[PDB]
Amino acid sequence: ADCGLRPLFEKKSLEDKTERELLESYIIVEGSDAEIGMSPWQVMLFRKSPQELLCGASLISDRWVLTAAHCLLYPPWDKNFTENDLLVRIGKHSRTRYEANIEKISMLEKIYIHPRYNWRENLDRDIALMKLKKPVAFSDYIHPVCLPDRETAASLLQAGYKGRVTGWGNLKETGQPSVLQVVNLPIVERPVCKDSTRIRITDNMFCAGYKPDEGKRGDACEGDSGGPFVMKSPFNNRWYQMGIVSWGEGCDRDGKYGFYTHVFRLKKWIQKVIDQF
């Protein structure tokens, strides 16, 4: 509703140091310290006991969180979290300090994993929702991102177009940053994404990232999964979550690419589960 409009930026008619890098393109390894409240919707999947960060996520409403399905469910490693095995921290900035009157710790009501999530082969439909026991309060640090729609999707999800990925994940291949990281990457053309790996691709997933001859680098890594991949719509100055950090081979390997769950391609589900409750 009031989604996509950041308190310490749009609301205050301000722009972040990398915002235009995105606009000017419409026709976390090697990132940078995000700026305060520049990713208000960012979330942290935290494990109660032992205490540990296990994924990134995103606030898409005072009562719902979005993240990768593998983050929560992955049989191969006996991973199968439950409503109260986890916590979700919101409004954070530092990866370790407990930002007292800034961040907000929320509990889980219900976990919703996509019925067709495919872990046996290629994390197809790598998405999952999380209802919060108690609704969260919006602040200049905790605000929702928008969910894409026909129009938005068609306009912004194109090769060359840059989206942004933020997180507290690793800075290389296995340490962690002391503050949320940010990096801007370009959407790659499906054909390239396809023959870049021997894994079977799907329309439910897209890949961003620079090519070997472009000079620049950057990618997502361990701990960024479940995190958002956004884009600012030039039209209404709003931010949309176009993807979810899903998978990838290594982290910023030449001629390798990061794969993201294709949000809009599954918005139907999202809508379904949220309306059904």
Swiss-Prot record:
Task: List residues traversing the bilayer.
Answer: none
Quote the range of the complete protein represented.
334 to 620 of 622
Task: Give the positions annotated as glycosylation sites.
Answer: N80
The residues covered by the Peptidase S1 domain are: 28-275
Under which name does UniProt file this protein? Thrombin heavy chain
Q: Where is this region: High affinity receptor-binding region which is also known as the TP508 peptide?
A: 208-230
- Record-annotated active site: H70, D126, S225
Q: Which domain of life is it from?
A: Eukaryota
Disulphide-bonded residues: C3-C146, C55-C71, C193-C207, C221-C251
Q: Which residues form a coiled coil?
A: none
Name the reported effect of E173A: In FA2D; Salakta/Frankfurt
